[PDB]
């Protein structure tokens, strides 16, 4: 359940913003927030484009482990569908990008026929690298728009969710050219844009 | 110039003890000298981790203030980079832990990417309280083995210093085991083991 | 009354002998014909003048103190200076830990802890001897821009704040005193001061 | 597993550059084509001393192109960082077979070791990589090194190669360096002044 593609289904609350760019490659740097709460269900930070397929890539956060974790799906494939081909041992499983930091995304729609995400960043423990992460065969050919989310998702009631978290997505670029975002939805949430940067804060 | 990386620079004399474990979290009691004479350098108590990043943590004596006063060096970073998160207006600047008071010293080689030192005791005015000292970002990871030394360091000559203390690091343990720790190298030093407990005593 | 120049003042009523705040640097700034500092410091018997000036040449904040007739030739630096002082600062928009006794040993020290321009992250123990300092009436936060020329010459616009105030292990709340060019926010133990002319 | 540096677990050709400088620049000749099955191709330069480093191109057969790569200490590829040029060079494209490339490399440019590439991606496009490794804080070195090497971590004994580069216009601190050979493993090396070829053939 999730509409990130303007229909109904953001069974959640947050804020969202538009990249309005057909581009191929997608750049930003993301404020992991320096904390959070979240009480009912899961917070999303991510990127992603619309309009053909639908893609949420971005990161996912971890009560458990106190991480922004990597997170991707593309089209009908998610989470148990993603490769990690560079990093894999210091962003996955127990691991993910520390809270606090400056993370940098880059997302190619289509390379060679695979989506790829790459992280720059740091983990819990103070290592910083590079993750390279793919869903192969996703073929992505024409879309309308990126996107620019912060949300708490969930598969219970949404009115049980109770949230505190604000991030930043800043210097983003698509094919090198700087895009500046428009506000699309406030859910409990507040979205500011100057320039090619939009700042989320999701309170509830 | 130091050389508790068993090679060298031990610009002094002292004693020296290894703990041979590889844990993360290292704990111990320090009784603290009730009497010292230090004549031509500066007397050192420290416990630290060794092989992958070099670490000092423990107490510098201070003859202006007759005090032993916290001291934290990890890797390359060191006096100048550590932050008192609790307790400082008690147990740093011209205070610290009194002569011949116990300290109980809590070492975490990386919470988070910080090392942090946790020091219960006593200072001059006999408060009794807890410092939490931290140095941040030093993502330390695979350690070889952990230390225990009583030295006196100089920037000058070795040939000089007289020197005439003595204290003993008891209920050591590291991941909540206790440990024994193994004489390494006695100068100008008497090191003597008993169980999880070592006593150093530092005559010139 | 010798504010030479414009700025906001608001008084901390505590006659405590240790003063902290951590105090967020503007992340933007200008000034145009005078020196912009951002100073905390004490009152009623040997002033003072304790926090940062702003640095055009360089880019950031300096450590500046003056206590009594004693001035920033007679600063000594115990710790730090190798990346706190000369070329360097305390970097725009990072937040630095003040603290401040009045009287240690007969010396007023200021200790920083903050950012520099490079990214080092650590301390300055900063120190003038022989200070003596007695009986105080209060403890004082100050953003402004102060000259030696001509006064409405001066255009500026630059925000801080100092934060989680305590003086004597304790702390305050903050009474605006003047508002000069400046607009001053308390809120408990804070005060936000805005310089725009 | 490399031995730069018993680990020279591959075949190649070495030659040593006897300069402490901090700052080596030289235009590689990167083969027209390569014949590599049972390891990987590398070319590339570094120092040597208390802190090893391997700066230079490694081989891709799946994109057929000679792709950035760095190593300095125990902090690799997959901590260098590219400030400019990383959409062009990077990922599946690299340096163009056949073509040549500068390489300049700071050891120590405020505590790190930076990589720049002047050269053309298989797509034609010509200019600049800039990669670097943070917080190396490389102190004094011995010497410098230009290599060829097939390496593997299986057995060197089914290494097949063919190819062919050179190191040309070699200078470190802008003073000329000649490098004199070190070892040769099926490899010819040849020495001209300040240029280096090398072949590797098995």
Tied chains: 1, 2.
Excluded: C, H
Excluded at 20 to 45: C, D, E, H, R, W
Excluded at 72 to 98: A, C, H, I, P
Excluded at 114 to 139: H, P
Aim: hydrophobic letters at 30%; zero cysteines.
């Amino acid at each position: 359940k999730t509409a990130e593609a303007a229909s109904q289904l953001t069974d959640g609350i947050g804020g969202r913003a538009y990249l309005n760019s057909t581009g191929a490659i997608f750049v930003t740097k993301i404020q992991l927030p320096s904390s959070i709460q979240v009480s009912n269900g899961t917070a999303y930070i991510y990127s992603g484009f619309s309009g053909g397929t639908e893609s949420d890539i971005g990161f996912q956060y971890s009560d458990k482990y106190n991480v922004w974790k990597p997170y991707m799906k593309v089209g009908s494939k998610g989470q148990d569908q993603v490769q990690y081909l560079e990093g894999g041992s210091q962003f996955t499983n127990t691991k993910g990008f520390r809270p606090g930091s400056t993370v940098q995304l880059t997302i190619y729609k289509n390379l060679n026929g695979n989506t790829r995400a790459t992280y720059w960043g740091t983990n819990n423990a103070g290592y910083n690298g590079r993750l390279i992460s793919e869903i192969s065969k996703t073929n992505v050919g024409s879309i309308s728009k990126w996107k620019a989310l912060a949300t708490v998702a969930t598969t219970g009631s949404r009115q049980s969710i109770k949230s505190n978290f604000s991030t930043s997505f800043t210097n983003i670029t698509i094919d090198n050219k700087a895009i500046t975002p428009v506000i699309d939805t406030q859910d409990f949430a507040k979205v500011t844009v100057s320039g090619n940067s939009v700042s989320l804060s999701v309170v509830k």
